[PDB]
């Protein structure tokens, strides 16, 4: 997706970290809104209690898991969810699985195929998710004012969608910035009641759920950055000691 | 007092290389430790009211069989018949009772009537399932892998196994069930 909104997220940069409360807000948004259509087949429910995530108490995760029910391998029959289960598959077969969506999408491109924009801005995944959620305008582009598809909605961030031939170009390719997406506009202001009394605008919820889906895609981002710093420090010290050893040694060859 | 700075430097760079190696090696070992299977907490209960006397039942937990048996009169009789000093292992391995009890068929039964015995179906030698059906000279169970004999209380009597078959945390709770895990 081109021209994604560059949202500042707290996990960005080498010192960035997840806001646990933003993750819990995003979990609520997913559970109440997105989980009706989409699924997360690769996420174990128990991971909601583990460090660096929402870090919920295990009894809350157990209560949460009990809302699901699954065809258990040994019953062959519907059995209430346990923390060892994964999140269910997408209930709507049309709706993509979200377990990796924040890694499976690029928001930033080029310039001119060089990959430098991604080199400073990152891949742009949760920014793309946020841009799609925020991407439904009030009014179509008016190019197909009487002529747009019925089962689809114009979204200014989405690029893979259908286009009306009156919006399409042979000379170019496409007039409009976006395209038409099969997902209905999922968010509305105050749609989710944040028990914290936090801002429940479309903007706020879209950030919160994009941060949650980032954690869903990279639940060990925190440990990865910590290991990065540890390894960089070891190799910095060792590089300096090796440099001085090399200089002392080759000073003999002079 | 001259080649002391050289040696100090050459050994300091060796020590930093050693630490940078130790940290590089430990993850390659630690990755083989348990990963998802750390989920050892679980719960189950079973319909004990199925079981007729002299019948042995099995159920899975923690990747392993748990036995249940409705003991026979003769299984209780030969059970009591053992004086504690005849046993290879005198300690009643039962986590439901408090640790350090004696294996006398009273600290090894799930209810005071002596009807019910529950155990891991797992030989304390090297983990094979000991075959029941009043097998073995001692009329309990026989380990097929190394010839280890258990009596009707699940007490080790002969062979290489060090200790009595362990009893998990199990209480009937209902007159027709036992709960485990």
């Amino acid at each position: 997706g081109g021209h994604v909104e560059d949202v500042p997220f707290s996990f960005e940069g080498p010192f960035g970290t997840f806001d646990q409360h933003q993750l819990q807000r995003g979990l609520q948004v997913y559970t109440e809104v997105c989980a009706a259509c989409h699924g997360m087949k690769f996420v174990p429910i128990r991971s909601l209690s583990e460090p660096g995530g929402p870090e919920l108490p295990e009894d809350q995760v157990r209560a949460y898991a009990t809302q699901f029910t699954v065809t258990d391998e040994e019953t062959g029959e519907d059995r209430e969810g346990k923390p060892t289960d994964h999140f269910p598959h997408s209930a709507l077969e049309n709706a993509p699985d979200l377990s990796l969506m924040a890694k499976a999408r690029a928001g930033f491109h080029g310039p001119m195929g060089t990959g430098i924009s991604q080199l400073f801005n990152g891949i742009g995944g949760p920014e793309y998710i946020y841009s799609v959620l925020t991407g439904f305008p009030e009014e179509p582009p008016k190019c197909a004012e009487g002529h747009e598809p019925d089962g689809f909605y114009y979204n200014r961030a989405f690029q893979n969608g259908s286009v009306p031939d009156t919006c399409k170009d042979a000379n170019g390719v496409k007039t409009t910035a976006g395209s038409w997406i099969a997902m209905p506009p999922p968010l509305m202001d105050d749609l989710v009641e944040y028990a914290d009394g936090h801002d429940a605008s479309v903007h706020a919820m879209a950030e919160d759920v994009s941060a949650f889906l980032m954690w869903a895609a990279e639940p060990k981002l925190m440990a990865r950055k910590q290991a990065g710093f540890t390894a960089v420090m070891f190799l910095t010290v060792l590089s300096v000691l090796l440099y001085l050893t090399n200089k002392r040694l080759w000073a003999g060859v002079k | 007092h001259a080649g002391t700075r050289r040696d100090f430097l050459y050994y300091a760079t060796a020590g930093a290389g050693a630490v940078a190696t130790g940290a590089a090696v430990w993850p390659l070992i630690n990755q083989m430790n348990p990963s998802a299977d750390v989920q050892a907490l679980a719960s189950i209960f079973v319909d004990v009211s199925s079981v007729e006397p002299g019948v042995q039942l099995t159920v899975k937990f923690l990747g392993k069989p748990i036995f249940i048996r409705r003991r026979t009169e003769a299984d209780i009789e030969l059970g009591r018949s053992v004086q504690l000093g005849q046993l290879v292992d005198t300690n009643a391995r039962n986590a439901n009772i408090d640790a350090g009890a004696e294996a006398t068929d009273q600290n090894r039964t799930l209810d005071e009537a002596g009807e019910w015995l529950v155990m891991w179906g797992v030989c304390t030698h090297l983990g094979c399932v000991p075959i029941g059906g009043v097998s073995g000279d001692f009329g309990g169970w026989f380990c097929p892998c190394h010839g280890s004999h258990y009596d009707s209380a699940g007490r080790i009597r002969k062979g290489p196994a060090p200790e009595n078959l362990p009893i998990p945390l199990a209480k009937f709770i209902d007159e027709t069930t036992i709960q485990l895990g």
Partner: peptide
């Protein structure tokens, strides 16, 4: 006496790697 600098050097390098990789990354 011998090993006055050999042993001392080794621990001085090892500890520095352990310290500066830990504390500054963690804090």
């Amino acid at each position: 006496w011998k090993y006055r600098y050999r042993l001392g050097g080794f621990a001085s390098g090892a500890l520095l790697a352990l310290a500066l990789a830990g504390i500054f990354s963690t804090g």
